[PDB]
Ligand binder design. Structure first.
Ligand SMILES: O=[N+]([O-])c1ccc(O)c(O)c1
Ligand SMILES: O=[N+]([O-])c1ccc(O)c(O)c1
Ligand SMILES: O=[N+]([O-])c1ccc(O)c(O)c1
Ligand SMILES: [Ca+2]
Ligand SMILES: [Cl-]
Ligand SMILES: [Co+2]
Ligand SMILES: [Co+2]
Ligand SMILES: [Co+2]
Ligand SMILES: [Co+2]
Lengths: 359, 359, 351, 355
């Protein structure tokens, strides 16, 4: 029911940056710069512009001081200047609100288009950006937990197939998904850049931003972030992990910033650039689908997510999911999951894996 | 309570091997050889003799077929032939039942003394052992999850201070422990070889064997064990982890063998060989003491452990712990844990960390 | 001076496989399967088809028994079936010899075009391929040295600018190169898939195949290959490395198969998918350009490379490079390199 | 030739610290703290006291400003205060010069004995030391190249068998050595703490200090040290490696400090604490003995080493080795090495491996 426009989709390269509204800029800076080691491209009393170790565009993360913590924009780089025009025509044909600024919404971005998309998310499309020193060989700066790239976003939306169809028309290709035997979709992952995803849809009340993910080189870099958070006595901000994902096969960690924005650290997924890249569908009851080692998924992972803003900076109203809840069908009192399909040994009924119930 | 003998203690080098009784030898072989990659020194219809990658003594693990799965012996190597005589005299003075076999209890061990120690555990002391090819540079054999050394044992016993004093008199030095502000010791770690430990006491009903631990070279090796267990669809046999320990600072994983004997994989603890090595005491309510990252300790970790045998091969009767339960005081109904001492934020009252409760 | 065809270029996805002729198939199998741990997709008495851990197409490497060890085909996957037609029209316009087999040249590949390209290299273009089990989560099979993807080829050719322009016309984008102040190009790296390269041109006598490269997940996997080669007492087959590259920033190792085909093991280069990806030019005298740690490049790495075959299976005649030699200008008797530009300390002259 | 004293040997725990005389304290600080990330226990205008990540004794390295760069002391910790007395009586009986100071020679060490040992090296034995914060869990400080422990020293000495017998009587156990088929010993490694070594003897003109070695947790930490040195454009201070050793099986790297004092970064050797630990002897012509991957050993690694000082602070005179030279027999003009014993293929005649 989101129609395919007659207008051609913009050619999207990759996820490029997020703008997050934060309430205390100094506390946020401590987290992203001092704890996580991201590199400052620009900062003032109002905003902090941050990039990963291997980035050459101006930034991967913009922290903007504001009254209500929320996602303000998730930005995708398009292939040419003309693709911004294509994005504008595309979303206008969808009847979405758009705003076009020839000199950008944030520093280091040129001609850019922001839109309130059909799922209620603030997307940005841009080509022009200020190139900065690519720090990829600055091993004099390299931290034991170095974040090397922006990898993806993850969005919470009530109707996954509706959103997926819309993203496929935009050019994103589905790589993996989670479904049940009676036709409910719980989550889908989709890419432009040849990794498992650039964005992903997680079934839930929405629009909300589930997380932004950065990559490391190696698994030990993710271990170090955990170790460093323990040393800083902020282990309570480690939400979930570390682990190996089923979907994507990446090694992962989820942590929470000072405003509870969720950040994933992620490494070593696989190549998806071929157009007949085999899709993988997982059963929602498979306890190795999210954590391959069977570790239980914390309920906050399923329930909590950041607000998103519309183009005036007001919070988007949330619409409730009516399809089945992943939490409820897997780890709730009526849930279940299995280690081996069909085997009662290693299956969990009315609780999570490993001997825990919901707190 | 356990008196210091007048007889000199044996000079103990290190933990050397454990003999575990298993119910199905083939299934147990599949676990230790095919899944974990231990190296077969000898086997027959009744026993499998296994060693780690860097070992030169005959074995680190003996699997013995029997009717009831149990620990049959935890074995420590002593410095000289004469230390076996010292051991016999020492335990005889302690009023303990002992058995001496000039040609060993298991193949590849010579003159050996087994004892029913004052905590009810079957200890063996030996010097003589058949040397085998040390595989430390056999990289043609090296597995992605290679177990390189035997590291320690961990024993469940109801009265930790009683056992701790006895082990200190035997020459083990306590490196770390867990206590509360009311005089209760929950656990202690003690060594001879200059690592955090060779054995350890965990407060609980006993005597029972909590685990046997093997080490890997690096953290990624432990990750690979998890990943392989996922691939073999036996993730339900991963009990707890992987993680970073608070006590010991080691990276760790706990898995369960076919008879539910617990095995820990462990790496990168610190040097303790100096006689005034600083002893570290953690508070039992510190939520970073067991898992540095704050991840909850599954209840089975506190409640489940292996039976131990007496010298006749009969199961030792279990004596109930009357001191406070670590489980109860941290994750139980009236339990409490903190992330930062004296901060309510990041504390847990009557449940586990990260959003979980006891199943 | 290779003219751009008016015919549209095929849309190339990536490097996909190489077909190497080997003289002793069993010896070759020992190296690629037992030492290196590649996964068998098919074998018989004449060929072995091998793939890396994360591959879903039929193979990344075909070993074919033949009388003379050589590269028989370096194969690139194209985006659609129609791109094979585009490739045929493109190379035909270039005046190249071509051969189309609607049922493929090797097993597991369908409609395929092979060509003797303008640099004398046997290129293949195909879309159709038999999908196989993607082993990316088969950690029960995973080796301590596991090879997880095919990453790139490297080609020895006498005139780098000439080849570079030809590959740019084909849609490859240069990511890094090596030049001097006099204006000589010694090497160039170029990509389609968004890594530092899918192929690369090394200045030298050619056409010859310098190496085929596979990636690992982590640096320790490369270390393990070395360690295993020591344990197998074949450390003499370790040619160069392990190291960190300057160009590409990748951790690397070069080893030699039983017919002296050079295999690179490679990991952790960077993303190049943006069309304005900044191009990095290194000076040929910078001693950190090839090995970032300043370790010397053994002369064999510059002088040795594999023969390539024409479409009849005969060895391609070789053309001598007339441009300056990177070996000669860096480690030859009149060569030099520096650690810090302009500093005699940490410089090497004739050495 | 060096007699075994009647007096009991001291019970030596491990190598504990080295005192290095350096010429420019600021440059040495930049290397050891800024490049390598060692932790400052104490510093003033004359000395920098440094320790590794997991250490609790006051320091593993003392950098002392002086006119001539050299080893001033290689220190071993002993098990009890009474073992310093035992050390003293032992070295007096050996006829060695000794000097004992109840309040130590450097800050952070108490009662200490220093000796000019029978091979001409300045050994210190102590028990008493000031405990400091053990940083083993301070992951807020942890560097990508973090040095976690002091592992060993390596000493250059002309007659290895002579030295080996002496260290053995002192309680060190030989774990590995290098010999040839003609009765010559080229190197030996020996331990107290249950690793491959606490010190080692390399055949060569001496006494000289070959290197001091620090451990990392993992192989990637050593790789990061190389990468950082490249980024700082000081790759010319990487001498050798990184590699896998044959002897010891450890992953390694050799780098040079501003006074050319050689530092090794080392990780993942094996447990040697059993008294019948099997000794491993390598042939000197085995090209996998030093670098398991057969990478060539640069001649500077065999020829260059640091001066050592006597108890008065003067440089020890160097005695020339007359036994065969490892450099000459493996990579010199008449040198030879093999990959596979008895196989001509993969052997090197009169030159180093790998072209
Ligand atoms: O398996 N899932 O839990 C996944 C897989 C990949 C992701 O990036 C993620 O956020 C969740
Ligand atoms: O730095 N060069 O020596 C390089 C860089 C990347 C490569 O894949 C290579 O084969 C050589
Ligand atoms: O094998 N050798 O070259 C070795 C082995 C261990 C060492 O610590 C060393 O400095 C050299
Ligand atoms: Ca209390
Ligand atoms: Cl624990
Ligand atoms: Co994600
Ligand atoms: Co343990
Ligand atoms: Co290459
Ligand atoms: Co050394």
């Amino acid at each position: 029911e989101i129609p395919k426009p007659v207008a051609p989709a913009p050619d999207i390269l990759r996820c490029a940056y997020a703008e997050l509204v934060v309430t205390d800029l100094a506390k946020s800076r401590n987290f992203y710069v001092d704890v996580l080691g991201l590199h400052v491209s620009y900062e003032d009393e109002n905003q902090i512009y941050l990039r990963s170790f291997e980035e050459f565009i101006h930034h991967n993360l913009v922290l903007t001081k504001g009254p209500v913590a929320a996602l303000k924009a998730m930005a995708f780089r398009v292939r040419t200047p003309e693709d911004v025009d294509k994005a504008e025509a595309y979303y206008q044909e969808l009847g979405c609100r758009t705003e076009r600024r020839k000199d950008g919404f944030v520093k280091g971005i040129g001609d850019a288009l922001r839109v309130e998309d059909p799922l209620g998310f603030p997307y940005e499309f841009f080509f022009e950006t200020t190139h900065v020193e690519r720090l990829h060989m600055r091993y004099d700066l390299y931290s034991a937990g170095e974040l090397v790239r922006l990898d993806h976003f993850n969005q919470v939306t009530p109707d996954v197939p509706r959103g997926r169809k819309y993203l496929e028309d935009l050019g994103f290709r589905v790589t993996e998904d989670i479904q049940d035997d009676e036709g409910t979709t719980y989550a889908a992952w989709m890419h432009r850049k040849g990794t498992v995803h650039d964005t992903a849809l997680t079934g839930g009340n929405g629009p909300r931003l589930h997380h932004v993910a950065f990559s490391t080189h190696e698994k030990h870099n993710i271990i170090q972030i955990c170790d460093k958070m323990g040393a800083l006595r902020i282990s309570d901000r480690i939400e979930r992990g570390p682990g190996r994902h089923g979907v994507s096969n990446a090694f992962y960690l989820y942590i929470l910033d000072p405003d509870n924005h969720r950040i994933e650290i992620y490494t070593q997924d696989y190549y998806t650039g071929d157009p007949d890249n085999p899709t993988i569908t997982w059963n929602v009851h498979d306890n190795q689908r999210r954590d391959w080692w069977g570790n239980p998924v914390v309920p906050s992972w399923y329930t909590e997510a950041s607000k998103v803003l519309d183009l005036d900076g007001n919070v988007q109203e949330i619409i409730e999911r009516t399809d089945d809840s992943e939490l409820e069908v897997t780890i709730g009192a009526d849930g279940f999951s299995f280690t081996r399909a069909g085997d009662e040994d290693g299956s969990y009924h009315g609780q999570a894996s490993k001997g825990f119930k919901l707190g």
